[PDB]
Short mmCIF file of N, CA, C and O in Angstrom, two decimals:
data_model
loop_
_atom_site.label_atom_id
_atom_site.label_comp_id
_atom_site.label_asym_id
_atom_site.label_seq_id
_atom_site.Cartn_x
_atom_site.Cartn_y
_atom_site.Cartn_z
N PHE A 1 110.13 78.99 138.03
CA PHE A 1 109.75 77.86 138.79
C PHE A 1 110.27 76.60 138.30
O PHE A 1 110.39 76.67 136.11
N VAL A 2 110.49 75.30 138.71
CA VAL A 2 110.56 74.31 138.08
C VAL A 2 109.07 73.63 138.65
O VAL A 2 108.85 73.54 140.14
N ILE A 3 108.45 72.21 137.92
CA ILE A 3 107.53 71.43 138.12
C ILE A 3 107.42 70.33 137.46
O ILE A 3 108.50 69.86 136.34
N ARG A 4 106.90 69.28 138.04
CA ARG A 4 106.73 67.55 137.19
C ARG A 4 106.65 68.01 135.86
O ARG A 4 105.54 69.10 135.82
N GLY A 5 106.63 67.39 135.14
CA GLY A 5 106.58 67.92 133.31
C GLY A 5 104.80 67.66 133.25
O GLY A 5 104.56 68.00 132.78
N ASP A 6 104.41 66.28 134.32
CA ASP A 6 102.85 66.14 134.03
C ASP A 6 102.36 67.36 134.86
O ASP A 6 101.46 67.75 133.64
N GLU A 7 102.25 68.05 134.96
CA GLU A 7 101.45 68.97 135.92
C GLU A 7 101.85 70.16 135.23
O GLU A 7 101.35 71.21 135.20
N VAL A 8 102.47 70.18 134.17
CA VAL A 8 103.19 71.48 133.15
C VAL A 8 101.15 71.87 132.79
O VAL A 8 101.30 72.54 132.22
N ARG A 9 100.38 70.78 131.76
CA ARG A 9 99.33 71.13 132.13
C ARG A 9 98.35 72.02 132.24
O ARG A 9 97.51 72.53 131.93
N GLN A 10 98.62 71.76 133.91
CA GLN A 10 97.65 72.43 135.07
C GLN A 10 97.94 74.37 135.27
O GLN A 10 96.76 74.37 134.97
N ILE A 11 99.20 74.80 134.71
CA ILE A 11 99.25 75.95 134.83
C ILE A 11 98.13 76.57 133.96
O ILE A 11 98.07 77.72 133.90
N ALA A 12 97.52 76.32 132.56
CA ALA A 12 96.97 76.75 131.52
C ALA A 12 95.45 77.24 132.12
O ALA A 12 94.94 77.24 133.44
N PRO A 13 95.06 78.84 131.96
CA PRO A 13 94.50 79.68 132.44
C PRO A 13 93.28 78.96 132.49
O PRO A 13 92.85 78.09 131.23
N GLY A 14 92.38 79.49 132.94
CA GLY A 14 91.08 78.11 133.92
C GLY A 14 90.75 76.77 133.58
O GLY A 14 90.15 76.57 133.40
N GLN A 15 92.06 75.99 133.49
CA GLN A 15 91.96 74.78 134.20
C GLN A 15 92.53 74.58 135.24
O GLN A 15 93.38 75.07 135.55
N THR A 16 91.94 73.95 135.72
CA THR A 16 92.12 73.11 137.35
C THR A 16 93.67 72.41 137.82
O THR A 16 93.95 72.43 136.70
N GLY A 17 93.29 71.56 138.83
CA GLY A 17 94.78 71.26 138.69
C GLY A 17 95.69 71.30 140.11
O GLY A 17 95.13 72.72 140.84
N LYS A 18 96.11 70.63 140.84
CA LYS A 18 96.65 70.62 141.89
C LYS A 18 97.32 71.86 142.35
O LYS A 18 96.73 72.40 143.28
N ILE A 19 98.19 72.11 141.49
CA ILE A 19 98.97 73.34 141.22
C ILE A 19 98.33 74.62 141.76
O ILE A 19 97.99 75.88 141.84
N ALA A 20 96.91 74.59 139.84
CA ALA A 20 96.08 75.15 139.99
C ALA A 20 95.36 75.50 141.57
O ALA A 20 94.68 76.91 141.16
N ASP A 21 94.45 74.25 141.91
CA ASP A 21 94.35 74.59 142.92
C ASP A 21 94.29 75.45 143.95
O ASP A 21 93.73 76.18 144.47
N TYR A 22 95.74 75.03 144.98
CA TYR A 22 96.36 75.91 145.31
C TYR A 22 97.27 76.58 146.09
O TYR A 22 97.82 77.17 146.75
N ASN A 23 98.06 75.70 145.09
CA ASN A 23 99.64 76.57 144.57
C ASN A 23 99.82 78.14 143.88
O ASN A 23 100.11 78.92 144.56
N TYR A 24 99.67 78.03 142.90
CA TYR A 24 99.71 78.88 142.09
C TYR A 24 98.41 79.10 140.61
O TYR A 24 98.61 78.04 139.98
N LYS A 25 98.08 79.95 140.42
CA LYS A 25 96.71 79.86 139.38
C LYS A 25 96.77 81.21 138.51
O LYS A 25 96.92 82.38 139.10
N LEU A 26 96.95 81.07 137.15
CA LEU A 26 96.74 81.83 136.55
C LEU A 26 94.79 82.97 136.41
O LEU A 26 94.56 82.11 136.80
N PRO A 27 94.81 84.37 135.93
CA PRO A 27 93.44 84.31 135.78
C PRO A 27 93.05 83.92 134.35
O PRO A 27 93.82 83.30 133.24
N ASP A 28 91.73 83.85 134.54
CA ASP A 28 90.79 83.11 133.36
C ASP A 28 91.10 83.33 132.29
O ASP A 28 91.37 83.06 130.94
N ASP A 29 91.16 85.17 132.51
CA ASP A 29 91.37 85.72 130.77
C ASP A 29 93.21 86.47 130.54
O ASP A 29 93.35 87.39 130.68
N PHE A 30 94.21 85.46 131.20
CA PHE A 30 95.73 85.57 131.21
C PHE A 30 95.80 86.04 129.90
O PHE A 30 95.43 84.86 128.85
N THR A 31 96.69 86.57 129.34
CA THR A 31 97.00 87.10 128.22
C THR A 31 98.74 87.27 128.59
O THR A 31 99.35 87.51 128.86
N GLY A 32 99.90 86.12 127.18
CA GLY A 32 101.14 85.91 126.96
C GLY A 32 100.94 84.76 126.69
O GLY A 32 100.18 83.89 126.07
N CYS A 33 102.09 84.26 127.22
CA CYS A 33 102.72 82.89 126.72
C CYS A 33 103.20 82.01 127.60
O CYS A 33 104.03 82.36 128.77
N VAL A 34 102.86 80.43 127.64
CA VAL A 34 103.41 79.95 128.53
C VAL A 34 104.53 79.52 127.55
O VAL A 34 104.61 78.21 127.11
N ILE A 35 105.84 79.45 128.93
CA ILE A 35 107.35 79.05 128.09
C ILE A 35 108.04 77.43 129.02
O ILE A 35 108.46 77.60 130.53
N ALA A 36 108.59 76.64 128.59
CA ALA A 36 108.60 75.26 129.59
C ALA A 36 109.83 74.43 128.87
O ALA A 36 109.74 74.50 127.36
N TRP A 37 110.22 73.88 129.12
CA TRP A 37 111.50 72.63 129.19
C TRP A 37 111.82 71.55 129.55
O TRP A 37 111.49 72.01 131.12
N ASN A 38 112.15 70.81 129.40
CA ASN A 38 112.51 69.33 130.24
C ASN A 38 113.79 70.12 131.00
O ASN A 38 114.94 70.53 129.78
N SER A 39 113.93 69.55 132.18
CA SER A 39 115.59 70.15 133.13
C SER A 39 115.78 68.99 133.47
O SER A 39 116.53 69.61 134.45
N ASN A 40 115.18 67.91 133.45
CA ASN A 40 115.96 66.20 134.15
C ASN A 40 117.25 66.61 133.91
O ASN A 40 117.98 66.13 135.11
N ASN A 41 117.74 67.31 132.84
CA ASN A 41 119.56 66.64 133.23
C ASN A 41 120.04 68.32 134.31
O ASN A 41 120.91 67.72 135.11
N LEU A 42 119.52 69.23 134.18
CA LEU A 42 120.07 70.44 134.92
C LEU A 42 119.58 70.02 136.35
O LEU A 42 119.64 70.49 137.29
N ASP A 43 117.41 69.36 136.76
CA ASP A 43 117.41 69.48 137.78
C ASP A 43 117.08 68.10 138.21
O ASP A 43 115.67 67.87 139.08
N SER A 44 117.98 67.30 137.94
CA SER A 44 117.35 65.64 138.74
C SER A 44 118.74 65.54 138.85
O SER A 44 119.55 64.56 138.40
N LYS A 45 118.83 65.12 139.86
CA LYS A 45 120.09 65.18 140.86
C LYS A 45 120.15 63.74 141.22
O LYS A 45 118.47 62.91 141.64
N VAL A 46 120.83 62.78 141.43
CA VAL A 46 120.96 61.03 141.99
C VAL A 46 120.06 61.01 142.90
O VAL A 46 119.74 59.91 143.09
N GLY A 47 120.61 61.62 143.89
CA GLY A 47 120.17 61.68 145.45
C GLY A 47 118.86 62.28 145.60
O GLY A 47 118.30 61.86 146.53
N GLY A 48 118.43 63.21 144.50
CA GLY A 48 116.74 63.98 144.63
C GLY A 48 117.08 65.35 144.77
O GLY A 48 117.71 65.52 146.07
N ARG B 1 76.72 74.10 139.49
CA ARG B 1 76.48 72.67 138.84
C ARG B 1 78.11 72.47 137.47
O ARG B 1 78.92 71.82 137.57
N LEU B 2 78.92 74.15 137.50
CA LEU B 2 80.20 74.14 136.80
C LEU B 2 81.01 74.99 137.32
O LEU B 2 80.58 76.16 138.41
N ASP B 3 82.51 74.82 137.59
CA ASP B 3 83.24 75.71 137.67
C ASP B 3 83.60 77.14 136.83
O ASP B 3 82.65 76.85 136.00
N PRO B 4 83.63 78.10 137.19
CA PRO B 4 83.53 79.21 136.57
C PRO B 4 83.99 79.19 135.05
O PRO B 4 83.37 79.39 134.39
N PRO B 5 85.17 78.67 134.72
CA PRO B 5 85.58 79.40 133.38
C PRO B 5 84.62 78.67 132.12
O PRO B 5 84.97 78.82 130.83
N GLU B 6 83.93 77.25 132.60
CA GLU B 6 82.72 76.77 131.50
C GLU B 6 81.32 77.40 131.97
O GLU B 6 80.64 77.82 131.08
N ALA B 7 81.07 77.86 133.36
CA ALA B 7 79.71 78.40 133.62
C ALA B 7 79.56 79.35 133.06
O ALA B 7 78.18 79.70 132.55
N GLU B 8 80.21 80.42 132.46
CA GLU B 8 79.84 81.67 132.03
C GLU B 8 79.22 81.44 130.94
O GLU B 8 78.41 82.27 130.04
N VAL B 9 79.68 80.37 130.01
CA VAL B 9 79.02 79.91 128.71
C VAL B 9 77.81 79.94 128.52
O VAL B 9 77.08 80.01 127.83
N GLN B 10 77.48 78.65 129.42
CA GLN B 10 75.73 78.52 130.05
C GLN B 10 75.28 79.72 130.13
O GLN B 10 74.13 79.75 129.75
N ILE B 11 75.56 80.44 131.18
CA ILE B 11 75.10 81.63 131.08
C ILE B 11 75.19 82.50 130.33
O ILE B 11 73.67 83.41 130.08
N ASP B 12 76.64 83.17 129.31
CA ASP B 12 76.55 83.66 127.88
C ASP B 12 74.85 83.71 127.32
O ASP B 12 74.26 83.98 126.67
N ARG B 13 74.76 81.72 127.00
CA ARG B 13 73.91 81.43 125.85
C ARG B 13 72.21 82.07 126.92
O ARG B 13 71.32 82.56 125.83
N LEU B 14 72.15 81.71 128.04
CA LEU B 14 71.05 82.06 128.83
C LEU B 14 70.68 83.95 129.00
O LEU B 14 69.96 84.24 128.21
N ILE B 15 71.95 84.71 128.64
CA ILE B 15 71.65 86.07 128.34
C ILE B 15 71.12 86.43 126.87
O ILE B 15 70.12 87.51 126.91
N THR B 16 71.19 85.65 125.89
CA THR B 16 71.04 86.15 124.62
C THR B 16 69.83 85.33 124.64
O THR B 16 69.14 86.39 123.93
N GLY B 17 69.22 84.63 124.77
CA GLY B 17 68.44 84.08 124.90
C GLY B 17 67.40 85.54 125.78
O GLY B 17 66.46 85.90 124.90
N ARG B 18 67.13 85.25 126.56
CA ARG B 18 66.20 86.46 127.73
C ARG B 18 66.63 87.75 126.52
O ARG B 18 65.86 88.19 126.53
N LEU B 19 67.72 88.36 126.20
CA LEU B 19 67.73 89.23 125.71
C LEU B 19 67.16 89.43 124.68
O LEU B 19 66.02 90.64 124.47
N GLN B 20 67.46 88.55 123.87
CA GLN B 20 66.30 88.15 122.44
C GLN B 20 64.83 88.68 122.57
O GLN B 20 64.23 89.17 122.07
N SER B 21 64.53 87.69 123.82
CA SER B 21 62.78 87.91 124.19
C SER B 21 62.60 88.86 124.16
O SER B 21 61.63 89.59 123.73
N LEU B 22 63.17 90.04 125.48
CA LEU B 22 62.91 91.51 125.72
C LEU B 22 62.50 92.10 124.92
O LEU B 22 61.53 92.77 124.03
N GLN B 23 63.98 91.92 123.65
CA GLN B 23 63.70 92.55 122.16
C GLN B 23 62.38 92.55 121.51
O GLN B 23 61.64 93.32 121.23
N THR B 24 62.12 90.99 121.80
CA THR B 24 60.87 90.69 120.64
C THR B 24 59.57 91.65 121.48
O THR B 24 58.62 91.51 120.88
N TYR B 25 59.36 91.20 122.48
CA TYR B 25 58.46 91.55 124.27
C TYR B 25 58.54 93.46 123.68
O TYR B 25 57.12 93.74 123.05
N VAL B 26 59.84 93.72 123.85
CA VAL B 26 59.46 95.40 123.54
C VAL B 26 59.46 95.98 122.24
O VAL B 26 58.21 97.06 122.24
N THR B 27 60.14 95.20 120.99
CA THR B 27 59.28 95.48 120.05
C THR B 27 58.28 95.08 119.24
O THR B 27 57.66 96.05 118.94
N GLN B 28 57.54 94.45 119.68
CA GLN B 28 56.48 93.90 119.17
C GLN B 28 55.17 95.22 120.84
O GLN B 28 54.51 95.24 120.01
N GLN B 29 55.78 95.64 121.56
CA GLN B 29 55.21 96.10 122.48
C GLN B 29 54.82 97.69 121.40
O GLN B 29 53.54 97.94 121.08
N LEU B 30 56.15 98.25 121.33
CA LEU B 30 55.66 99.57 121.19
C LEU B 30 54.68 100.11 119.41
O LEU B 30 53.90 100.55 119.91
N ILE B 31 54.99 98.44 119.14
CA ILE B 31 53.98 98.76 117.45
C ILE B 31 52.56 98.65 117.62
O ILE B 31 52.17 99.73 117.20
N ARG B 32 52.56 97.99 118.65
CA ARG B 32 50.48 98.50 119.40
C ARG B 32 50.52 99.24 119.95
O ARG B 32 49.63 100.33 119.94
N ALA B 33 51.35 100.19 120.61
CA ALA B 33 51.61 101.39 120.82
C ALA B 33 51.00 102.56 120.16
O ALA B 33 50.60 103.13 119.89
N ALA B 34 51.89 102.65 118.95
CA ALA B 34 51.67 103.04 117.32
C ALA B 34 50.02 102.75 117.32
O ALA B 34 49.74 103.95 116.69
N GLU B 35 49.89 101.53 117.34
CA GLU B 35 48.36 101.23 116.65
C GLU B 35 47.61 101.98 117.77
O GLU B 35 46.38 102.48 116.70
N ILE B 36 47.29 102.03 119.06
CA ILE B 36 46.31 102.36 120.20
C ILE B 36 46.36 103.75 119.65
O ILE B 36 45.47 104.13 119.64
N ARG B 37 47.69 104.46 119.49
CA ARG B 37 47.94 105.79 119.51
C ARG B 37 46.77 106.32 118.58
O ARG B 37 46.68 107.90 118.44
N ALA B 38 47.36 106.08 117.45
CA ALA B 38 46.78 106.19 116.01
C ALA B 38 45.41 105.95 116.45
O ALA B 38 44.24 106.96 115.76
N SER B 39 44.84 105.29 116.99
CA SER B 39 43.33 104.86 117.66
C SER B 39 42.86 105.85 118.41
O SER B 39 41.67 106.57 118.36
N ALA B 40 43.45 105.99 118.88
CA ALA B 40 43.37 107.55 120.18
C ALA B 40 43.17 108.38 119.41
O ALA B 40 42.17 109.54 119.84
N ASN B 41 44.23 108.93 118.77
CA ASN B 41 44.01 110.54 117.44
C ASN B 41 42.49 110.29 117.00
O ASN B 41 41.69 111.12 116.96
N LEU B 42 42.15 109.25 116.61
CA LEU B 42 40.94 109.16 116.13
C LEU B 42 40.04 109.51 116.75
O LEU B 42 38.75 110.20 116.36
N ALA B 43 40.06 108.95 117.93
CA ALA B 43 38.82 108.65 119.21
C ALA B 43 38.87 109.75 119.25
O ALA B 43 37.60 110.73 119.44
N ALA B 44 39.99 110.35 119.58
CA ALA B 44 40.21 112.46 119.96
C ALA B 44 39.51 112.65 119.43
O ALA B 44 38.50 113.95 119.54
N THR B 45 39.25 112.89 117.63
CA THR B 45 39.12 113.93 116.62
C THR B 45 37.45 113.60 116.62
O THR B 45 36.52 114.38 116.63
N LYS B 46 37.07 112.13 116.95
CA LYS B 46 35.50 112.08 116.82
C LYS B 46 35.11 112.34 118.00
O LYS B 46 34.13 113.10 118.14
N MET B 47 35.80 112.77 119.25
CA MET B 47 35.08 113.53 120.52
C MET B 47 34.87 114.67 120.47
O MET B 47 33.75 115.85 120.46
N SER B 48 35.72 115.79 119.66
CA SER B 48 35.89 116.97 119.54
C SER B 48 34.43 117.42 118.45
O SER B 48 34.06 118.39 118.33
N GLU B 49 34.69 116.32 117.15
CA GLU B 49 33.61 116.54 115.87
C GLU B 49 32.54 116.13 116.43
O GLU B 49 31.00 116.85 115.88
#
């Protein structure tokens, strides 16, 4: 999925956040890795 | 007063305290039980003799 860079920290397990609050939340004891990168070039259209 | 992911930590600390107290109480208890039981055997022998 694609999210604003600011809410990247929201996805952290056990951490709240608008996305965490009601969009999608990891379990507090999630095991694995969080991989993300800037997609500004690929996913930022001049028209929005 | 606290959201889940940090509330268990406070809960966890309380568990240690209360559990430790039970061990102290229980551990203290049976020691007296041995003493009184030892005293009881003395009393029983005195009754018999």
